[PDB]
Amino acid sequence: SMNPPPPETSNPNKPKRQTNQLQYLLRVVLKTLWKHQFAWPFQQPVDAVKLNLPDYYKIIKTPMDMGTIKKRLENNYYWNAQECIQDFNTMFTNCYIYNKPGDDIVLMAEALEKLFLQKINELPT
Numbered sequence: 001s002m003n004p005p006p007p008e009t010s011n012p013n014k015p016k017r018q019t020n021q022l023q024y025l026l027r028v029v030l031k032t033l034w035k036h037q038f039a040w041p042f043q044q045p046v047d048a049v050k051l052n053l054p055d056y057y058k059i060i061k062t063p064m065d066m067g068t069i070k071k072r073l074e075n076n077y078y079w080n081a082q083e084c085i086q087d088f089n090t091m092f093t094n095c096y097i098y099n100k101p102g103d104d105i106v107l108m109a110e111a112l113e114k115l116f117l118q119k120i121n122e123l124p125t
């Protein structure tokens with residue numbers, strides 16, 4: 001179909017291990033953004049069919065969304081905090097390169113990104 005399969009969220013042969021930073025990314029970063037009033041465009045993969053964005057997956061080579069990130073954190077998919085930070089960055093990049101700068105969706109992403117950056121600047125060592 002027009003939409004790809006969603007990104008993988010389970011890492012079956014990776015050992016499960018906590019880190020301080022991954023705890024922070026789930027319990028502080030993801031939780032804060034997930035509950036934000038503007039989270040809803042970002043809580044699941046973009047549905048190009050329902051949104052009538054037939055070129056979305058032409059332009060966006062690496063789909064990413066917070067529902068995927070949440071599942072990855074809850075499944076201990078990431079080997080390190082930087083992979084998770086990269087996924088957040090990719091999500092925001094996708095929004096900014098696809099949508100018009102004045103789109104309400106872009107303005108919502110910018111508010112979430114500011115909060116993301118504020119929390120990441122306090123990432124523990």
Ligand SMILES: Cn1cc(-c2ccc(C(=O)Nc3cc(-c4ccccc4)ccc3N)cc2)c2cc[nH]c2c1=O
Binds near residue numbers: 040042046099105
């Ligand atoms: C990342 N992203 C997401 C969306 C998007 C937009 C809308 C939705 C969505 O769930 N839309 C929706 C909102 C309400 C709603 C929200 C607030 C108040 C009232 C009603 C209801 C139903 C639906 N389907 C998802 C996703 C999008 C649209 C154009 N470009 C992008 C983009 O880059």
